[PDB]
Amino acid sequence: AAQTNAPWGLARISSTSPGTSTYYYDESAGQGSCVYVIDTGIEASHPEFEGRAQMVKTYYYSSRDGNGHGTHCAGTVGSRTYGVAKKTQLFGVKVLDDNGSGQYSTIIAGMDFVASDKNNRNCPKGVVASLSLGGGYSSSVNSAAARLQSSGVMVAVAAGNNNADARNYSPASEPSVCTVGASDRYDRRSSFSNYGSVLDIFGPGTDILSTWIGGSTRSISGTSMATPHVAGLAAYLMTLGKTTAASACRYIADTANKGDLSNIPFGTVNLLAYNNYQA
């Protein structure tokens, strides 16, 4: 399958050079997999989700995304026009308020909910969790993320947006999850993107067009945009059967585009997420 005039990040996922605009992918498109978007919520009514998005848990009075951050992130996972896995099932877990701010107790409880909820969901191809959030170092937050991964969920987390070593951030510093940095359309590490040995993969993160609340669209930047590229890629590759939740992060890193990004400091992987499209 091919999507012409795709967002540059989607085209980058299937290409071996910057500056293309057509996204090539297998028709399976992540159908049969599930991605939990742990964020401000998901506007499930957005026509770009085609009914494949639903809110399953909120730690606030409403389950609605009153901010837009979570809807944008979920759009990059599996929206029709802006998603990597255009046929996956999206589940919304609202751990961030409508200001985009989270809590220690709610974010930790949210990861516990996903591991307990996935049983009763139809996800024959596997379960993924996308965490476009982060904070200071916390062994508790790291332990909660590792426990979600050990439950049988591919956990992708954002590295952070402070141009700093992600070792001092959680859950970015948890080794057992997949920590994602951001790149720009010119294959340079995004000016804001965190780095460090704890990073596993890079994804498109600068000027990422995706869904927004009110049935609209918006282009924003951050490692919060790069993480759903990797979460959608994992769900796509798990549906294809070439990896599972336990092996997806290493498999993505093993099959990534190597050494093509610029301004990658020594000690940080030079790997860009790549679907290795087999026509």
Q: Does residue 252 sit within a domain?
A: yes
The dihedral sign for the CA sequence 59, 171, 185, 192:
positive
Residue 224 a catalytic site member: yes
Report resolution in angstroms. Answer: 1.6
39 is catalytic: yes
d(CA 183, CA 175): 21
Identify the CA nearest to 225 among candidates 82, 128, 63.
82
| Domain membership flag for residue 153 | yes
Of 33, 130, 173, 224, the active-site residue reads: 224
* Number of Cβ within a 10 Å radius of residue 169: 27
Record the tokens describing residue 271, joined without a space.
Answer: 């790997």
Domains contained in the chain, number: 1
Q: CA-CA distances (angstroms) from residue 61 to 57, 95, 98, 133?
A: 11, 11, 11, 21
Residue 44's domain spans which residues?
A: 2-272
Q: 3-state class of 115 per DSSP?
A: helix
The alpha-helical segments, DSSP class H, found in the chain are 8-14, 69-78, 104-117, 139-150, 223-240, 248-254
Q: Assess whether 69 carries a catalytic annotation.
A: yes
Does some domain include residue 277?
A: no
Q: What's the CATH number where 48 sits?
A: 3.40.50.200
Residue 230, SS3 per DSSP: helix
Residue 25 lies in a domain: yes
Residue 226 forms part of a structural domain: yes
80 three-class SS: coil
Residue 125 in any domain: the answer is yes
Catalytic hit among 46, 69, 72, 229: 69
**Which residue in 14, 15, 39, 183 is the catalytic one?**
39
CA distances from 268 to 59, 136, 229 (A): 35, 20, 19
Known binding residues for Ca(2+) are 16, 175, 177, 200, 260
Method used to determine the 3D structure? X-ray
Binding site as annotated, residues: 16, 175, 177, 200, 260
Q: Determine how β-strand 216-220 pairs with β-strand 208-212.
A: antiparallel
What six digits make up the tokens of 105?
A: 């107790």
